[PDB]
Write a protein that binds this ligand. Structure first.
Ligand SMILES: O=C1NC[C@H](I)C(=O)N1
Ligand code: SF4
Lengths: 1012, 1019
């Protein structure tokens, strides 16, 4: 027989690139290396002076954009800090900790809800906020080598997913009905300008219940600068439209073609028409001009940022204007005057118009550029040239068009004063000139319409910085027009701030007062109306999430705070009779080593050698009475433990019952410590003992009680059944897994107690034991149908919680997830579960896995271009191949240059918790019930691949050597020797890059040698 | 009574900053926000035009420097790619995949060994390589939002730890003894210039066995440009000294004060003195000059990069020159001409000398700067000004001092040609001028000493690009002198490339030939001599690592490659008699969800519903015969399974024994599939059945055999004991844990088989089950002392392997770690175990935890300054506090400058084992002494948490865990965000467990009387 233990020529060939440790140092001349380097190049070449062509290319260029894979990693990395400095550094005070936590838990709805609650333009800001100067600038992770969290990108991702869900906004469900609202709320309100500031202000007013809000916009388009000037390649117009419609869901009206101006709309005309309040958010409508450009027109090649950017926007933003205008024909050398952030958008936009070269010329130095670094970077990588210390003086015109610009050198002296030497003239060539000197409010017709409000020295309407109120009580202003805000988020905040005092003003005009403490409503949608209550063993839970008997329930004061946060129920730490009082050792709770040396947020497990509660039964019983008195709707379950003694169990259970506990939990599963005292596992591993203890309790009390089972047994069903036979109303599955978390290199354990550095087997908790808990819950559910199960073991999100519900559990206990964070996670779990149930009724989102959209082919989270000349060309994203892709993409843009949002409606009833419990059991069975004829094979999407070769290595040393890994393109190809083991898909770093599909060829197992 | 379920005022107060979900939108005016922002500011202010004072500040400014915490995260993130593009993009071809894998496995020694094997200046390069234009430029992770891997920083970290280990280099232990080396190896070899190129060349020649190698260096210092010009704030001189000493460990000699010149050393004098070969690595010793600077001196304020940088270096690098060197007094405006990478080091160095302002003036545009971006950024963040399109023409001097420089405008025409308008003159003020136009070789006395080698039109010695050989057969050249290399790493490669052909040349001169395939030796140290063999049940294992019976052993051809890679032993996939032939389903192996939505490298677990081998017993038995025939020293264990039938077990075991297997493994633990056919989990949970099966096998065969136990039982010791009573020679602990990995939101499972999307309980493997496996191994070891244990369950490194050895196991089976990577991990496991055993004999490194140094107070991996005026000042690293810290640090630098206290020497000495290196047999079971009952633990030796404020990153996680999961014992300052553990601490240890900074929080003995809180008094 051939040499069986040896690879034939063909396999040896397929394994050519499989890693093998070298026995000697490598030998490759410096010349050979220089010639080989360019083939694998991924990033920009520092020696390349050009860059691809960007004409008519408006694809997203943001470095912060994230796909799901990337967002999940970055969200998990976030420390989710207390009193977070990032939130303090956010103009709209977004609870960054909460929304990022929701993202890491895959609860995109909850994340978006939190974002929009404080920022009505959440998506826009996620995309355009100059974070390095705001939230990200204060991020604690800046103190790590990996750096600060990409907050903007994460905000953008959650908001994008929400937008894709097509869920509308609704008024707070707690507000009185429309007709029951006081008369004051029907007061006519007017807002001028449809920009971030007015959109924000009108949104909050609408949240408060005002039913007659109207925004008067001068232009035919809405959104202000977010629409008219911010480039499409930074902020898609589609985003603006999304946020505008969300506002309209609250009844806000918008009327375009209406301007604030003398003989148009004025404060007087509004007052005479009955309007009770007005908000001014018209921004700075005019370009800051300069003498030297007088008479210059566009025909000659001159523009101000106010002239240029809107032209590019109208041409590149579909939906902005009814008319499809041409892209400004910019050819030759372009000069952008100024170093502000607007100048850089002019420079980058110029390139899209066909500019051959773009020069940014400013009167100060490089160090004086005050534009956000991230913005400056975009212009720099697109090869814009920078010319410092030059002040414009003349725009030389010859032939009816600009041919150059004359400058004069500038310089700083000692005192730090700037001088411009008039003798040193500079001649710069240029076919087009764009001034980006800023914007202002000059139009006398407009200023006049604001009479008689007071203006300050800046020639801008004066307002109280806290109330946003002008000299005229009923008139407020905010945004660019006030001159303080420098960003979209600050403008949104101005409108937000104003909304509260406009509310206060209006209510007072009707003789009504408002709360002393500001109460702007949060953001709501129909998802928030979803009922997640559940009944079990005769008990009613407002939600299925509760605190397990553990460290988070060390004290009853903590349970009170958990209930105040919103937890449906809670277990007391396990307590006992005075004679069984315990004393803990220290250290006793350590982090898991189950997922490597990863510290901080999201520990994959914990190990503890803690005993039951150190507090007395008297303390616990009095505490339960207090808790039930103050929180009658929150379920309190008393966890108790006794040795194998009938009188003790009856005494303690009755004492607990008399205190008012809704139910009891019998701790028959402590994996350490209590066992030596004749309790815990010893009693919980023997069906007979479990049965008798339950009988003793059943006979002692009338309230329901549940037996908490240990997973450390051969057959957990036998003890679950014993509990049922004994009279238990259900079982809690499960307690911690017995284990040893590890040793230091010197052999000592952790935890290590005392000078002797001793330890004992502890209990493992967390996500690392979830597979064990899920198996336990499902086996019990299948064996004892209908028998109440309280799940516990690795529940850290609505998503994982739903898994246990589907597995047969009715309620969900949590410990480790709280130890990893805090009690506020309940907000995430509830909004998350509501969203998951809501989405099950949306027919158009059935291709989604929970809150996750179906993964689309992408690279760096950005969708891959669907150009015919690119598909199936084996062009990886590196080296000469990358160069070809760019050439094809640019070509496509030139070719293209040559050529309604509706909410989804539930088409079926939203399921209730009772409708989903146990629905997964139908898929579970024996191995024999699985089909061995319906085989699958792996198929790789070459467009999503990042060429790492992990699929290849896993199949080579852990599989069937079925993958070909190209030595030039580093692209893998699954051949037909694939057996569908699925390991390659399991190790792939790109989510859904590899998928398992039905095998079309006949499957035949490899026997190595024929059978007889 | 008081309301027990309520927090008293004091606690409510301590909980002030504890997170609580808001019921309404927040309200904070834009003005209020603007005023609050600066208090929490971490990064540079885009509105601030001046960077803190840097006079005499030579602290590390590299953004790529990593501490252990950061290195482990970045190493774990690396994809560890096949045929890695980063390696292809590295001039020395470092096996980046391997060394980063070693780092993620905490095997810093193995990482360093791999690095130095291909690059003798591994640490230097890690710190200075312009990676964006090299290795990192080709990193696949560039295609992800998080970006490319910080390869240089990881290389630097591993190399730094190795440096701290103070382990010397030794010649390959396989080379013949010195006296038995052929005469050819005693040939006198000479190298000119002690720079990267010569150091590399001499190192490899020494590795090959040459015993008479001498480097002649012109200056009194060694290291070349790494020493004389690269700033101390980018490359500490002691890094250079470290690498020089490693080279000297191989006998290489260095003689300073000897120059290659017409007056001293020439090719002719060397030839007449008997030298058989020479390597020229003198670089480009002279500055590129320009007529307009004729006559200008330092006194007036003029310097070339060649004049300036060496002065700053001699003054800031302790150990470079023994004499005292005054820091160049540079005050006023400084002009650096040029935009090359040297210009930027001149600019940043000028600031350290006292420059008030530094301007970089270049004749082309910003887009034309060809210096690596990372270098440009350093100058930019330190506020250096940039002036483009300006070409120097005249230097104005008054009072014997420079006062200005005259330039002329430049620009490109439509043809791409550069022009300089002579009419547009520019007057720029300046007190100091530094030209950084490059370097060259012009000295006729030096060029003459190279006669008669041929020079090319670049006026540089001509060499064959592949052999590095000049027109004179015995003379080779490399590095800057050749004009191709632009980096330290390329210069190192030039010397590396030349060493092989110099070797070939010399051998040929003695009538000997060399292998057709280049065989430059790897890097070796005494650690490599450590014996990691072990004996168990009469079997001899060359190393304790082996492949578990699993996917990695699906085919015997895979086992062959694993043995070729170096694995000590391997198990065949479990096989059975023909009548019990199985057929797998698909999908059947999925990634674990045990550590969240983290994909790619290092999955924390896998779940499988795979059955035993689909290949026949005939295939397996023939395969074992073949494997044992070709690898007699590698242990092969045949895994077999039968239903509860005596004849079957005896038939199969005998068939396996006859094939030549060293031993057998009885699979009595498959947690799924086989149970239905009456095997695996069925028979392995009952002590009686286990005992009988072992008895049947014991009487059927004579070779040793082990029972593979399942962890899915109440008492694993009962099964293990049953196996021992049945005659088993040992047990394998353990097989996979029974579980369900999860469901999709629609309720369907994964894996899901068929259109019905069905599944069944599978087996969990990987690090997620290690706690269960460790417990199993320790409990069996304590109950049955001396009984052989083969460990399996989450072993993915030498470190984790050592934990199982310490727990009682003799050998280590691996599966998931290979599924997560490949067979080469064996190299990491072996070097790692050798290092861990070696370190146990080094007395001066007892404060280390294995290969991990004790954690020093740091921020971003950089040691915190020990200035008195900073300690205990509650100055966090943000906002106005950060401003204060910088002010204090700058003052300290000025204070240290006034001292002119000639820097202390530098004597590097190797640590010597002061006790025998333990063998595997000496560590087995050594951890059992610390294990016991809960009652054996002391409840009087309590501890409390103590936080090092200097390492804290102010996240408040310790605060939040103690609040909602602890005892509300931590105060979190609302202004500094600094936590303080109070006396109410109970030492639960949760805060330390969730802290993101390794060792920021430590548990220390409680000094106050500990008293449990009862809530209510006892009666
Ligand atoms: O995890 C496993 N799968 C297949 C049968 C075994 O022994 N173990
Ligand atoms: S050891 Fe425990 S009681 Fe002490 S400050 Fe840390 S979480 Fe709180």
């Amino acid at each position: 027989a051939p040499v069986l233990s040896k690879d034939v020529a063909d396999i040896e060939s397929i394994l050519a690139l499989n890693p093998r440790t070298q026995s000697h140092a490598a030998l490759h001349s410096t010349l050979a290396k220089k010639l080989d380097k360019k083939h694998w190049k991924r990033n920009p070449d520092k020696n390349c002076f050009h860059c691809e062509k960007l004409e008519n290319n408006f694809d997203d260029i943001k470095h912060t954009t994230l796909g799901e894979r990337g967002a999940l990693r970055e969200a998990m990395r976030c420390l989710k800090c207390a009193d977070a400095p990032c939130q303090k550094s956010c103009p709209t005070h977004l609870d960054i900790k909460s929304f990022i936590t929701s993202i890491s838990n895959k609860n995109y709805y909850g994340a978006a809800k939190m974002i929009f609650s404080d920022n009505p333009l959440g998506l826009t800001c996620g995309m355009v906020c100059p974070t390095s100067d705001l939230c990200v600038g204060g991020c604690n992770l800046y103190a790590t080598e990996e750096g600060s969290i990409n907050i903007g990108g994460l905000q953008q991702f959650a908001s994008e997913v929400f937008k894709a869900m097509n869920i509308p906004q609704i008024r707070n469900p707690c507000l009185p009905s429309q007709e029951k609202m006081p008369e004051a709320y029907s007061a006519k309100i007017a807002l001028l300008g449809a920009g971030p500031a007015s959109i924000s202000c009108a949104s909050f007013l609408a949240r408060l219940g005002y039913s007659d809000i109207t925004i008067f916009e001068k232009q035919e388009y809405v959104g202000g600068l977010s629409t008219s000037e911010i480039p499409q390649f930074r902020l898609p117009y589609d985003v603006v439209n999304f946020e505008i419609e969300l506002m309209k869901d609250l009844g806000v009206k918008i009327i375009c073609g209406k301007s604030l101006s003398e003989n148009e709309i004025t404060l007087n005309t509004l007052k005479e028409e009955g309007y009770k309040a007005a908000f001014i958010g018209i921004g700075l409508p005019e370009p800051k001009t300069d003498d030297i450009f007088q008479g210059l027109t566009q025909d000659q090649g001159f523009y101000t940022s106010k002239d240029f950017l809107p032209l590019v926007a109208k041409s590149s933003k579909a939906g902005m204007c009814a008319c499809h205008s041409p892209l400004p024909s910019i050819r030759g050398a372009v000069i952008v005057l100024g170093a502000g952030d607007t100048a850089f958008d002019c420079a980058t936009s110029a390139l899209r118009c066909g500019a051959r070269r773009v020069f940014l010329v400013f009167r100060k130095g490089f160090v004086n550029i005050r534009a956000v670094p991230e913005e400056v970077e975009l212009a720099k990588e697109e090869k814009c040239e920078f010319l410092p210390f030059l002040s414009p003086r003349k725009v030389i015109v010859k032939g009816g068009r600009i041919v150059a610009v004359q400058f004069v050198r500038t310089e700083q002296d000692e005192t730090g004063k700037w001088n411009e030497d008039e003798d040193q003239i500079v001649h710069l060539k240029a076919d087009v000139v764009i001034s980006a000197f800023g914007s202002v409010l000059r139009d006398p017709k407009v200023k006049e319409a604001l009479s008689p409000i007071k203006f300050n020295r800046w020639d801008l309407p004066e307002v109280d910085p806290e109330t946003m109120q002008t000299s005229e009580p009923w008139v407020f202003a905010g945004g660019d027009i006030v001159g303080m805000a420098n960003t979209t988020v600050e403008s949104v905040n101005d409108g937000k701030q104003a909304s509260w005092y406009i509310h206060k003003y209006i209510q007072a005009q009707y003789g009504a007062s408002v709360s002393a403490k500001p109460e702007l409503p949060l953001f709501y949608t129909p998802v928030d109306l979803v009922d997640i209550s559940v009944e079990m063993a005769g008990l009613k839970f407002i939600n299925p999430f509760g605190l397990a008997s553990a460290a988070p329930t060390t004290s009853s004061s903590m349970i009170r705070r958990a209930f105040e946060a919103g937890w449906g129920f809670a277990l007391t730490k396990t307590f006992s009779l005075d004679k069984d009082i315990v004393t803990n050792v220290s250290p006793r709770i350590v982090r898991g080593t189950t997922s490597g040396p990863m510290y901080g947020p999201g520990q994959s497990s914990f190990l503890n050698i803690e005993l039951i509660s150190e507090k007395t039964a008297a303390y616990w019983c009095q505490s339960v009475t207090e808790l039930k008195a103050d929180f009658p709707d929150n379920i309190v379950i008393a966890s108790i433990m006794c040795s194998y003694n009938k009188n003790d169990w009856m005494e303690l259970s009755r004492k607990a019952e008399a205190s008012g506990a809704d139910a009891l939990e019998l701790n028959l599963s402590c994996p350490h410590g209590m066992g030596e005292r004749g309790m815990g596992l010893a009693c919980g591993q023997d069906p007979e003992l479990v049965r008798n203890i339950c009988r003793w309790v059943r006979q002692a009390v009338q309230i329901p009680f549940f037996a908490k089972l240990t997973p450390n047994v051969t057959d957990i069903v036998s003890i679950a059944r014993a509990a049922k036979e004994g009279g238990a109303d259900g079982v809690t599955a499960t307690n911690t897994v017995s284990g040893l978390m590890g040793l230091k290199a010197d052999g000592t354990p952790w935890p290590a107690v005392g000078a002797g550095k001793r330890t004992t087997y502890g209990g493992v908790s967390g996500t690392a034991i979830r597979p064990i808990a899920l198996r336990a819950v499902t086996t019990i559910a299948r064996a004892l149908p209908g028998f109440p199960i309280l799940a516990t073991g690795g529940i850290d999100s609505a998503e994982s919680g739903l898994q246990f519900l589907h597995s047969g559990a009715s309620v969900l206990q949590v410990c480790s997830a709280v130890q990893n964070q805090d009690f506020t996670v309940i907000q995430d779990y509830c909004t998350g579960l509501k969203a998951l149930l809501y989405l099950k009724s949306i027919e158009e989102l059935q291709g989604w896995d929970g809150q996750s959209p179906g993964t689309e082919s992408h690279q760096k989270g950005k969708p891959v271009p669907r150009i015919a000349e690119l598909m199936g060309k084996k062009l990886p994203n590196f080296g000469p191949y990358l160069e070809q892709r760019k050439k094809i993409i640019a070509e496509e843009k030139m070719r293209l240059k040559e050529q309604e949002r509706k909410p989804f409606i539930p088409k079926k009833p939203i399921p209730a918790i009772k409708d989903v419990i146990g629905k997964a059991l139908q898929y579970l069975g024996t191995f024999g019930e699985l089909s061995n004829i319906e085989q699958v094979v792996a198929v790789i999407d070459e467009e999503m691949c990042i060429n790492c070769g992990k699929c290849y290595m896993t199949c080579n040393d852990s599989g069937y050597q079925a993958i070909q890994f190209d030595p030039e393109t580093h692209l893998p190809t699954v051949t037909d020797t694939c057996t569908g083991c699925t390991l390659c898909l399991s190790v792939c770093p790109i989510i859904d890059c590899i998928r398992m599909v039905s095998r079309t060829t006949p499957y035949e197992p490899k026997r190595g040698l024929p059978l007889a």
